[PDB]
Design a protein around this motif. Structure first.
Motif, PDB file in Angstrom:
ATOM      1  N   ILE A   1      15.787  61.389  12.267  1.00  0.00           N
ATOM      2  CA  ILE A   1      14.737  61.338  11.231  1.00  0.00           C
ATOM      3  C   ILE A   1      14.067  62.705  11.018  1.00  0.00           C
ATOM      4  N   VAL A   2      13.762  63.413  12.124  1.00  0.00           N
ATOM      5  CA  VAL A   2      13.113  64.734  12.029  1.00  0.00           C
ATOM      6  C   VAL A   2      14.045  65.783  11.392  1.00  0.00           C
ATOM      7  N   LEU A   3      15.352  65.704  11.695  1.00  0.00           N
ATOM      8  CA  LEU A   3      16.320  66.615  11.072  1.00  0.00           C
ATOM      9  C   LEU A   3      16.523  66.352   9.573  1.00  0.00           C
ATOM     10  N   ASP A   4      16.421  65.084   9.137  1.00  0.00           N
ATOM     11  CA  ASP A   4      16.527  64.769   7.706  1.00  0.00           C
ATOM     12  C   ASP A   4      15.338  65.322   6.905  1.00  0.00           C
ATOM     13  N   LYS A   5      14.127  65.256   7.489  1.00  0.00           N
ATOM     14  CA  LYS A   5      12.945  65.847   6.843  1.00  0.00           C
ATOM     15  C   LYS A   5      13.034  67.377   6.728  1.00  0.00           C
ATOM     16  N   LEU A   6      13.580  68.037   7.767  1.00  0.00           N
ATOM     17  CA  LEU A   6      13.806  69.488   7.704  1.00  0.00           C
ATOM     18  C   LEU A   6      14.843  69.888   6.651  1.00  0.00           C
ATOM     19  N   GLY A   7      15.865  69.045   6.444  1.00  0.00           N
ATOM     20  CA  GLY A   7      16.823  69.288   5.366  1.00  0.00           C
ATOM     21  C   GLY A   7      16.224  69.200   3.968  1.00  0.00           C
ATOM     22  N   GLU A   8      15.256  68.287   3.775  1.00  0.00           N
ATOM     23  CA  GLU A   8      14.546  68.207   2.488  1.00  0.00           C
ATOM     24  C   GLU A   8      13.695  69.454   2.200  1.00  0.00           C
ATOM     25  N   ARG A   9      13.039  69.997   3.242  1.00  0.00           N
ATOM     26  CA  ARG A   9      12.288  71.255   3.080  1.00  0.00           C
ATOM     27  C   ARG A   9      13.198  72.448   2.756  1.00  0.00           C
ATOM     28  N   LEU A  10      14.405  72.461   3.341  1.00  0.00           N
ATOM     29  CA  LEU A  10      15.383  73.508   3.027  1.00  0.00           C
ATOM     30  C   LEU A  10      15.902  73.425   1.589  1.00  0.00           C
TER      31      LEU A  10
ATOM     32  N   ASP B   1      11.853  51.264  -4.320  1.00  0.00           N
ATOM     33  CA  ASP B   1      10.784  51.133  -3.344  1.00  0.00           C
ATOM     34  C   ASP B   1      11.299  51.520  -1.965  1.00  0.00           C
ATOM     35  N   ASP B   2      10.369  51.839  -1.069  1.00  0.00           N
ATOM     36  CA  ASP B   2      10.735  52.229   0.285  1.00  0.00           C
ATOM     37  C   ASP B   2      11.116  51.004   1.107  1.00  0.00           C
ATOM     38  N   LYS B   3      12.297  51.052   1.716  1.00  0.00           N
ATOM     39  CA  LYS B   3      12.751  49.989   2.598  1.00  0.00           C
ATOM     40  C   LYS B   3      12.340  50.330   4.029  1.00  0.00           C
ATOM     41  N   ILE B   4      12.875  49.598   5.003  1.00  0.00           N
ATOM     42  CA  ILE B   4      12.413  49.737   6.382  1.00  0.00           C
ATOM     43  C   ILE B   4      13.037  50.981   7.031  1.00  0.00           C
ATOM     44  N   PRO B   5      14.409  51.220   7.079  1.00  0.00           N
ATOM     45  CA  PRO B   5      14.834  52.559   7.503  1.00  0.00           C
ATOM     46  C   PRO B   5      15.103  53.498   6.338  1.00  0.00           C
ATOM     47  N   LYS B   6      15.587  54.690   6.661  1.00  0.00           N
ATOM     48  CA  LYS B   6      16.282  55.507   5.682  1.00  0.00           C
ATOM     49  C   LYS B   6      17.782  55.245   5.705  1.00  0.00           C
ATOM     50  N   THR B   7      18.273  54.583   6.756  1.00  0.00           N
ATOM     51  CA  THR B   7      19.708  54.464   6.983  1.00  0.00           C
ATOM     52  C   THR B   7      20.338  53.342   6.167  1.00  0.00           C
ATOM     53  N   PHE B   8      19.635  52.222   5.990  1.00  0.00           N
ATOM     54  CA  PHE B   8      20.232  51.026   5.399  1.00  0.00           C
ATOM     55  C   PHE B   8      20.062  50.958   3.887  1.00  0.00           C
ATOM     56  N   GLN B   9      19.878  52.098   3.222  1.00  0.00           N
ATOM     57  CA  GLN B   9      19.839  52.121   1.768  1.00  0.00           C
ATOM     58  C   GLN B   9      21.229  52.063   1.160  1.00  0.00           C
ATOM     59  N   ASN B  10      22.255  52.440   1.924  1.00  0.00           N
ATOM     60  CA  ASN B  10      23.603  52.560   1.384  1.00  0.00           C
ATOM     61  C   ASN B  10      24.263  51.202   1.201  1.00  0.00           C
ATOM     62  N   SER B  11      23.976  50.256   2.089  1.00  0.00           N
ATOM     63  CA  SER B  11      24.644  48.965   2.077  1.00  0.00           C
ATOM     64  C   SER B  11      23.822  47.878   1.404  1.00  0.00           C
ATOM     65  N   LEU B  12      22.743  48.237   0.717  1.00  0.00           N
ATOM     66  CA  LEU B  12      21.817  47.264   0.148  1.00  0.00           C
ATOM     67  C   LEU B  12      22.016  47.211  -1.364  1.00  0.00           C
ATOM     68  N   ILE B  13      22.761  46.209  -1.827  1.00  0.00           N
ATOM     69  CA  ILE B  13      22.985  46.010  -3.255  1.00  0.00           C
ATOM     70  C   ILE B  13      21.810  45.259  -3.865  1.00  0.00           C
ATOM     71  N   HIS B  14      21.762  45.208  -5.192  1.00  0.00           N
ATOM     72  CA  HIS B  14      20.588  44.753  -5.918  1.00  0.00           C
ATOM     73  C   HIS B  14      20.977  43.572  -6.797  1.00  0.00           C
ATOM     74  N   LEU B  15      20.180  42.504  -6.759  1.00  0.00           N
ATOM     75  CA  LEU B  15      20.500  41.281  -7.485  1.00  0.00           C
ATOM     76  C   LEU B  15      19.241  40.638  -8.051  1.00  0.00           C
ATOM     77  N   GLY B  16      19.451  39.756  -9.035  1.00  0.00           N
ATOM     78  CA  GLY B  16      18.392  38.950  -9.600  1.00  0.00           C
ATOM     79  C   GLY B  16      18.481  37.505  -9.129  1.00  0.00           C
ATOM     80  N   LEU B  17      17.375  36.777  -9.337  1.00  0.00           N
ATOM     81  CA  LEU B  17      17.103  35.514  -8.647  1.00  0.00           C
ATOM     82  C   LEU B  17      18.003  34.366  -9.093  1.00  0.00           C
ATOM     83  N   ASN B  18      18.398  34.341 -10.370  1.00  0.00           N
ATOM     84  CA  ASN B  18      19.203  33.236 -10.883  1.00  0.00           C
ATOM     85  C   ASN B  18      20.655  33.318 -10.425  1.00  0.00           C
TER      86      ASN B  18
END
Lengths: 192, 174, 200
Positions: free
Chosen positions: C80-89, A13-30
């Motif tokens: 953010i705008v440069l990352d979208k341009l990289g996806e189009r490339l 699913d889409d998170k809040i930035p594009k940047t913080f996907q790398n440091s976000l590990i995945h876990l279950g509730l128990n």
């Protein structure tokens, strides 16, 4: 906390930035209900090879129990296969910002100027708790990039080159951290 | 079922207040861009429509002041219920959490840093609405419009923090 | 008459691949235009911020660290705008590689069977069909047009740097200049010529 390592889920699913996907590990509730791990705080992971890495948890459901879900870039940074074991502990020690961090790099990327590299490293890696012996990632203008982390300096004055306890003080990268890099006229009163 | 319902009210009122802040900021940016275009059409070439545009910018700032008043009383009653639980449960007590994991002092620090950030940003908007209609250097006009648009005292990761309460209340599905 | 039918059915396979990848290419360039307008606006705002001094302007001495926070928010919007341009490339590079692999498949199966079918059979037009030589020449022109356009757009997107802002403000005129400079309607006219051969 000693659950086996598996890959990240394909249902992303889409998170809040594009940047913080790398440091976000995945876990279950128990796992957080059993091992007493708070959410929204960084946790320390110890592998069998002696490498310690600190990340941030996020508790979506639809996850198999008895496993820890890590990204494949984090699996390549740790150096483990799907099926290995890892130790998870919450950080109970106090953490604060740092002052000096030095960058180890190969020869082929000495042509990049230091100032905008330092600015892009500080802007992409914000709020990341750093440790020596780790390979950080940032996407410089669409091109990927790799670098090595040496020793750190503390605000209290203590010097790190060991710190394997959850009560130990760790340091996170913010602004006003100065970055070191590794591999006229004068007219004084003397010379008048 | 009493304090936890106050967390249920507090997270939803936080999210609703962020949404009305965004709507009022879009209205203010449209009025400020019209003000700067009227000023450059004045100077390149009156007081009734300029006074009217400044007055609706003042009405936008009054709405943002009302939102900040509700923010301050919500953080004050969150501080009051955390101090009420700290006084009621005593000092030496291992409190089980109201939800699965979190204690309530984390909610107090989240509300305190969100209140500090939006309180600084409102003061910068008052200075921009003071100094926008009189300046003549166009670089400073572009800088004042960029300070209205980009909001430099509101940080990005605090949105992640708001979503932490959205996984401590449960309005979003797990 | 087996090898001439082999060459003809290979060409019949090859042309509707080029129709789908031309549709993908047009959708990617139509996405590429307003992000470049967004970069031009943000570079104008950053030059207006860097032009003046915040130490001598009245009623801004109460805020002592404003310029770095404003510059940080403008720079993360630019990333953010440069990352979208990289996806189009990446979409454009996938289109180029698949079109070139299908064209080399057609030339491989022509070079296998080329001695049994003479020059006279290749050089013969008909009332519904152009010759095989014209179609091979047209496919070679399609491959060279795609490779030249991709490499020009890649060098233009690799010359973006935040130290100089005049070339960032002059990017959309060069992006329109690339589309104005090349041959105008190449793929559509070739497909309109060969459609009567295809629907037979």
């Amino acid at each position: 906390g000693t659950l086996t390592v598996t890959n990240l889920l394909e249902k992303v699913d889409d998170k809040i930035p594009k940047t913080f996907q790398n440091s976000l590990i995945h876990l279950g509730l128990n796992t957080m209900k059993s091992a007493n791990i708070c959410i929204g705080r960084p946790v320390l992971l110890t592998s069998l090879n002696g490498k310690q890495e600190v990340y941030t948890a996020w508790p979506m459901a639809g996850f198999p129990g008895g496993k820890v879900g890590l990204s494949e870039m984090a699996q390549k940074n740790v150096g483990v296969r799907p099926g290995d074991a890892i130790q998870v502990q919450p950080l109970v020690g106090a953490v604060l910002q740092a002052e000096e961090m030095d960058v180890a790099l190969s020869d082929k990327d000495m042509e990049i100027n230091e100032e905008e590299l330092t600015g892009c490293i500080l802007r992409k890696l914000d709020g990341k708790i750093v440790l020596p012996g780790n390979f950080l990632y940032c996407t410089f203008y669409g091109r990927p990039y790799k670098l090595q982390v040496l020793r750190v300096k503390g605000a209290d004055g203590m010097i790190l080159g060991g710190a394997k306890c959850n009560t130990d003080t760790f340091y996170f990268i913010s602004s006003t951290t100065r970055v070191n890099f590794t591999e006229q006229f004068k007219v004084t009163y003397d010379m008048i | 079922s009493v304090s936890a319902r106050k967390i249920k009210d507090n997270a939803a009122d936080w999210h609703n207040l962020i949404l009305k802040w965004e709507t009022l900021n879009d209205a203010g940016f449209t009025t400020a861009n019209n003000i700067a275009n009227l000023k450059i059409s004045l100077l390149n070439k009156y007081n009734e429509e300029l006074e009217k545009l400044c007055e609706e910018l003042q009405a936008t700032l009054d709405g943002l002041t009302k939102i900040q008043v509700k923010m301050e009383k919500l953080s004050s009653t969150t501080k009051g219920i955390c101090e009420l639980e700290n006084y009621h449960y005593g000092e030496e007590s291992k409190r089980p959490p109201l939800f699965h994991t979190w204690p309530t002092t984390h909610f107090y620090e989240v509300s305190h840093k969100l209140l500090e950030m939006y309180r600084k940003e409102l003061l910068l908007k008052r200075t921009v609405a003071k100094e926008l209609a009189h300046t003549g250097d166009p670089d400073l006009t572009l800088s004042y419009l960029s300070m209205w648009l980009h909001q430099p005292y509101v940080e990005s990761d605090s949105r992640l923090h708001l979503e932490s309460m959205l996984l401590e209340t449960g309005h979003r599905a797990l | 008459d087996r090898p001439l039918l082999a060459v003809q059915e290979a060409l019949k396979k090859c042309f509707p691949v080029v129709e789908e990848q031309q549709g993908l290419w047009q959708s990617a360039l139509r996405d590429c235009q307003p992000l470049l307008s967004s970069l031009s606006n943000l570079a104008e705002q950053l030059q207006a911020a860097q032009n003046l001094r915040f130490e001598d302007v009245p009623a801004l001495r109460a805020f002592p660290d404003l310029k770095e926070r404003l510059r940080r928010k403008q720079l993360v919007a630019g990333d953010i705008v440069l990352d979208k341009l990289g996806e189009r490339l990446a979409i454009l590079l996938k289109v180029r590689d698949m079109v070139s692999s299908h064209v080399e498949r057609v030339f491989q199966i022509y070079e296998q069977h080329a001695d049994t079918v003479g020059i006279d059979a290749v050089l013969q037009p008909s009332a519904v069909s152009p010759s095989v030589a014209d179609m091979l020449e047209w496919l070679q022109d399609i491959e060279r047009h795609y490779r030249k356009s991709y490499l020009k757009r890649k060098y233009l997107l690799s010359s973006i740097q935040w130290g100089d802002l005049a070339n960032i403000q002059a990017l959309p005129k060069a992006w329109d200049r690339i589309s104005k400079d090349e041959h105008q309607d190449l793929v559509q006219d070739i497909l309109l010529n060969v459609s009567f051969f295809l629907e037979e």
